[PDB]
Design an enzyme around this catalytic site. Sequence first.
Site, PDB file in Angstrom:
ATOM      1  CB  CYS A 142      -0.801  -0.001   1.138  1.00 17.13           C
ATOM      2  SG  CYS A 142      -0.100   0.157   2.908  1.00 17.13           S
ATOM      3  CG  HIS A 195      -4.704   0.330   3.557  1.00 20.60           C
ATOM      4  ND1 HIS A 195      -3.873  -0.175   2.887  1.00 20.60           N
ATOM      5  CD2 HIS A 195      -5.758   0.873   3.122  1.00 20.60           C
ATOM      6  CE1 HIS A 195      -4.332  -0.171   1.543  1.00 20.60           C
ATOM      7  NE2 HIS A 195      -5.295   0.296   1.691  1.00 20.60           N
ATOM      8  CG  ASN A 236      -8.396   0.540  -0.660  1.00 20.95           C
ATOM      9  OD1 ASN A 236      -7.133   0.613  -0.490  1.00 20.95           O
ATOM     10  ND2 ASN A 236      -9.427  -0.128   0.132  1.00 20.95           N
TER      11      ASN A 236
HETATM   12  C1  LIG Z   1      -0.379  -1.388   3.758  1.00 21.79           C
HETATM   13  C2  LIG Z   1      -1.091  -2.816   3.114  1.00 21.79           C
HETATM   14  O1  LIG Z   1      -0.709  -3.076   2.050  1.00 21.79           O
HETATM   15  O2  LIG Z   1      -2.270  -2.960   3.848  1.00 21.79           O
HETATM   16  C3  LIG Z   1      -3.248  -3.484   2.895  1.00 21.79           C
HETATM   17  C4  LIG Z   1      -3.522  -5.067   3.360  1.00 21.79           C
HETATM   18  C5  LIG Z   1       1.004  -2.133   4.073  1.00 21.79           C
HETATM   19  O3  LIG Z   1       0.903  -3.027   5.104  1.00 21.79           O
HETATM   20  C6  LIG Z   1       2.097  -0.973   4.740  1.00 21.79           C
HETATM   21  O4  LIG Z   1       2.938  -0.644   4.327  1.00 21.79           O
HETATM   22  N1  LIG Z   1       1.562  -0.469   6.077  1.00 21.79           N
HETATM   23  C7  LIG Z   1       2.119   0.628   6.853  1.00 21.79           C
HETATM   24  C8  LIG Z   1       3.604   0.372   7.087  1.00 21.79           C
HETATM   25  C9  LIG Z   1       4.109  -0.976   7.734  1.00 21.79           C
HETATM   26  C10 LIG Z   1       2.960  -1.310   8.805  1.00 21.79           C
HETATM   27  C11 LIG Z   1       5.431  -0.568   8.545  1.00 21.79           C
HETATM   28  C12 LIG Z   1       1.749   2.082   6.594  1.00 21.79           C
HETATM   29  O5  LIG Z   1       1.742   2.513   5.690  1.00 21.79           O
HETATM   30  N2  LIG Z   1       0.753   2.487   7.906  1.00 21.79           N
HETATM   31  C13 LIG Z   1       0.115   3.743   7.943  1.00 21.79           C
HETATM   32  C14 LIG Z   1      -0.121   4.363   9.636  1.00 21.79           C
HETATM   33  C15 LIG Z   1      -1.480   4.568   9.965  1.00 21.79           C
HETATM   34  C16 LIG Z   1      -1.651   3.949  11.332  1.00 21.79           C
HETATM   35  C17 LIG Z   1      -1.679   6.178  10.149  1.00 21.79           C
END
Ligand SMILES: *[C@@H](C(=O)OCC)[C@H](O)C(=O)N[C@@H](CC(C)C)C(=O)NCCC(C)C
Length: 255
Positions: A30, A200, A220
Site C-alpha cells: 500500500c 493502510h 484504495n
Molecule cells: C499497507 C497494506 O498493504 O495494507 C493492505 C492490506 C502495508 O501493510 C503498509 O505498508 N503498512 C504500513 C507500514 C508498515 C506497517 C510498517 C503503513 O503505511 N501504515 C500507516 C500508518 C497509519 C496507522 C496512520
Amino acid sequence: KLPASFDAREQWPQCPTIKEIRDQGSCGSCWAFGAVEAISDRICIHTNAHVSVEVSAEDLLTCCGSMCGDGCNGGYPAEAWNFWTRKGLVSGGLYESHVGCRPYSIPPCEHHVNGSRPPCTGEGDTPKCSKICEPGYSPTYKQDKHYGYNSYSVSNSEKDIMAEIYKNGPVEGAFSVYSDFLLYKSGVYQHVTGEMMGGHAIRILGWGVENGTPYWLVANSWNTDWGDNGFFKILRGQDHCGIESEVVAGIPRTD
Ligand SMILES: *[C@@H](C(=O)OCC)[C@H](O)C(=O)N[C@@H](CC(C)C)C(=O)NCCC(C)C
C-alpha cells in the site's frame, strides 16, 4: 476561498491516471501504491497533460530497499516520495499489461469481496530490483526515470490538506483500518465497530459533503470491485482513524 467540494478527476479531465484504481495484489505494498498513484497524477498536472504515465509500483516496491521499509512486508510513504527525488521512478502498468518499463509483477486478487480472481492471501515475497525494462520498450530503464523535485509532509490540518490537493494535486495519506472498514460499499465511512487491523496507505484526491457529513475522496488499491468502484469516502475534519495525520506529497521535476 476553498470550495465545499473538489474532485481531482473533474479538475484535470485530461489526466486519466487520476481516475485509475490499481490492485496491490497479495503484497503489503500500500505504501508504494499510494505514492506512485499520486506521483502519476502530479506528473500529468505538472505538464498540463503533456506527460501522462503510469508510474511503476514495481520499481518503487523492489528498488527502494531498506530505506522505504521491507517491500511486501510494508513500508514508509514519506521515504517512498524521497526515493522518487533521489533515484526516480520508471513507468509501468498493471499486472500482465506489458505497459511501460516495469509493469507490476504481482497478480490481482479479490480483497474482501467476491469475484472471478483468486482471493488475496498473506503478504507475499518482495520481487527483485530489476533495472531493465520489459523487452521492446524503447526508452532504457535509466532514461525512463521520472524524478521528484522534493518530498514533504502536509500538516495535520484539514484546510492545509485541502489547499495542497487544490493547488498541487492528489496526495498520499494513511489511516488505521478497523475490521468494519473492510466491508465498505458506499457513503462516508466512520469507524463504529471492529478491532484494529493495521495501518493502510492510500491516495486522497478530493473532498465533499454527503448528507451533511464532510468527507475525503479516497482511492484504495484493492481493485475496482472493492468499495465504491475502488474508491471510498471517509470522515473529514476530525483526524478520523488518523486520515489527516500522515499526508505526504512532492512536486515533480520537469522531464
Ligand atoms: C499497507 C497494506 O498493504 O495494507 C493492505 C492490506 C502495508 O501493510 C503498509 O505498508 N503498512 C504500513 C507500514 C508498515 C506497517 C510498517 C503503513 O503505511 N501504515 C500507516 C500508518 C497509519 C496507522 C496512520
